[PDB]
Design a protein around this ligand. Structure first.
Ligand SMILES: [Ca+2]
Ligand SMILES: [Ca+2]
Ligand SMILES: [Ca+2]
Ligand SMILES: [Ca+2]
Ligand SMILES: [Ca+2]
Ligand SMILES: [Ca+2]
Ligand SMILES: [Ca+2]
Ligand SMILES: [Ca+2]
Ligand SMILES: [Ca+2]
Length: 162
């Protein structure tokens, strides 16, 4: 179970599935989300999402790329994330904020549960599970998913329970 839980988290970052985490895993994730919502890469929201993704890669690399080759292997990839999950969530905050912007289709600063599910599928979550996860992210049940729900959820998700 534990090792399976760890692989799940690794697989989330290893978007292209090739067994190491690269900047391009993150670039690819940004590209997928923008495509899902028809947001132009060159738009303000597009540039903000790529900048946020690049910042999260650098944070994660800072933590886990022990030999400095700018790929994080399965091997290199948990304890550091478990002991300080809040710090890692803040590293991800610009990315998560930008992702919400992209998934906000009417511009009112809120994202629907259905569009949260769309975002998750852009990041490789199969459609059925994404609906279930999106629903779970809406912890106050108002049908709107926000930064105050997503950022702590992210912190928790990357705290692999022992
Ligand atoms: Ca990869
Ligand atoms: Ca750019
Ligand atoms: Ca490395
Ligand atoms: Ca919306
Ligand atoms: Ca909205
Ligand atoms: Ca479908
Ligand atoms: Ca189902
Ligand atoms: Ca909510
Ligand atoms: Ca709410």
């Amino acid at each position: 179970e534990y090792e399976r839980r760890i692989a799940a988290r690794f697989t989330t970052f290893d978007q292209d599935g090739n067994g190491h985490i690269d900047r391009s895993d993150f670039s690819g994730a940004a590209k997928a989300l923008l495509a899902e919502f028809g947001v132009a890469a060159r738009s303000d929201r597009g540039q903000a999402l790529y900048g946020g993704a690049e910042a999260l890669w650098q944070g994660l690399a800072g933590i886990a790329d022990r030999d400095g080759d700018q790929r994080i292997t399965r091997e290199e990839f948990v304890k550091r994330l478990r002991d300080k999950p809040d710090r890692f969530a803040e590293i991800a905050r610009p990315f998560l904020h930008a992702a919400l912007g992209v998934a906000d289709t009417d511009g009112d600063g809120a994202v629907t549960v259905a569009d949260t599910a769309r975002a998750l599928t852009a990041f490789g979550v199969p459609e059925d599970l994404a609906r279930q996860a999106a629903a779970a992210l809406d912890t106050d049940g108002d049908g709107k998913v926000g930064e105050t729900e997503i950022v702590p959820a992210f912190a928790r998700y990357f705290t692999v329970p022992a």
